[PDB]
Design a protein around this motif. Structure first.
Motif, short mmCIF file in Angstrom:
data_model
loop_
_atom_site.label_atom_id
_atom_site.label_comp_id
_atom_site.label_asym_id
_atom_site.label_seq_id
_atom_site.Cartn_x
_atom_site.Cartn_y
_atom_site.Cartn_z
N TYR A 146 0.82 -1.20 0.00
CA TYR A 146 0.00 0.00 0.00
C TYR A 146 0.86 1.25 0.00
CZ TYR A 146 1.11 0.60 4.98
OH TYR A 146 1.77 0.79 6.17
N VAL A 148 -9.30 -4.27 -3.49
CA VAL A 148 -8.29 -4.28 -2.43
C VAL A 148 -7.48 -5.58 -2.48
CG1 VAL A 148 -7.89 -4.31 0.04
CG2 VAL A 148 -9.55 -2.70 -0.89
N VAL A 179 -7.78 1.07 1.82
CA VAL A 179 -7.59 -0.29 2.32
C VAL A 179 -8.18 -0.44 3.72
CG1 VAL A 179 -5.86 -2.01 2.91
CG2 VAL A 179 -5.59 -0.67 0.82
#
Lengths: 197, 194
Positions: A125, B164, B175
């Motif tokens: 991420y 995701v 997320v």
């Protein structure tokens, strides 16, 4: 639904400048990019906090249903937290040529004293892409939490359920740990099945 | 739990390193050690950009989520595309509340009136190098009413969560919010439809 509309090829990075260089960097990107209507943007500049990219490991013991957390001060937390000592996942910077898995295994050893068995990817991420390039890639790593031993750092062993309730309560509130422990709460049944076979 | 409090840290100085749109400060400080005593003087570079409010727009009647798409050039070096699918979000100015900012941005960025809200979580984006805190709410929206260069997407909850899983949504705020929604949507849908 179709998902995103444009790709790399649809933006022109004209030039980059480093406005501050110390332990980290503050960079300025100058760029042009396609617009949803078809046209092309003018030239745009954005400041970017540049600090490299990280590997993160969630140490999970599937026999004991326990996780290993590390506690240390993160002074940047000071202004918005009751304490700047945070409970976190093992993590470290990825140097050129290193893999996520090698860094994650290394840091689990030299940050928590943990020998890691199997690993599996969790998620990768962008921490905050409006202002920083930083990407963090998380793995779950198989450990024996009863061995956990271990920059001034304290090693904690807690049940998965306690760790997740601490996310719910706000006692664990850094992105890497939140993302990892939410993932664990969604996947621990299958992970315990896969790693106890 | 953790061991120490703010009484156990001395911030000696904060030294400006960079002042532009964002700031970079050098924190100079000393702190208590687990085995006793205090550190010597430590310095850390800290990126200062204020703090944000984030809203996950969830339609509990339809089991749908509203996403906003726009370019985030800092994603360029490590992503397949710098255009990201994101939650509604905005900076919190002096004296504003998370609720007020989240609701204003939901209307501004996506044309959404918000009904009820609940807190999801408030998190530090990357506290090894930035002070930034983002506080996430889930907001009740009518997904049939959804209308910086920005594009609005209405997708099923299951589609958003699958993205995701696949890495097609991979920014921390989205997320965290969508993993939370996956853990809580059954009770949330009942609470907001019953």
């Amino acid at each position: 639904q179709q998902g995103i509309t444009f790709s790399k090829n649809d933006v022109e990075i004209i030039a980059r400048e480093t406005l501050y260089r110390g332990f980290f960097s503050l960079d300025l990107y100058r760029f042009r990019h396609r617009l949803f209507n078809g046209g092309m943007s003018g030239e745009i500049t954005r400041e970017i906090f540049e600090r490299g990219h990280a590997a993160v490991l969630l140490p999970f013991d599937p026999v004991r249903d326990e996780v290993v957390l590390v506690e240390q001060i993160r002074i940047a937390a000071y202004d918005t937290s009751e304490s700047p000592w945070l409970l976190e996942m093992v993590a470290g910077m990825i140097e050129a040529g290193e893999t996520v898995e090698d860094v994650a295994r290394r840091e689990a050893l030299e940050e928590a004293g943990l020998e890691v068995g199997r690993t599996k990817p969790i998620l990768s991420y962008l921490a905050s892409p409006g202002g920083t390039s930083e990407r963090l890639s998380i793995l779950v790593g198989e450990v024996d939490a009863s061995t956990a031993k271990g920059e001034d750092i304290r090693v904690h062993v807690v049940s998965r359920e306690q760790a997740y309730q601490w996310v719910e309560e706000g006692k664990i509130d850094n992105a890497a740990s939140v993302i990892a422990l939410q993932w664990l709460q969604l996947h621990y049944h299958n992970l315990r099945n896969e790693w106890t076979k």
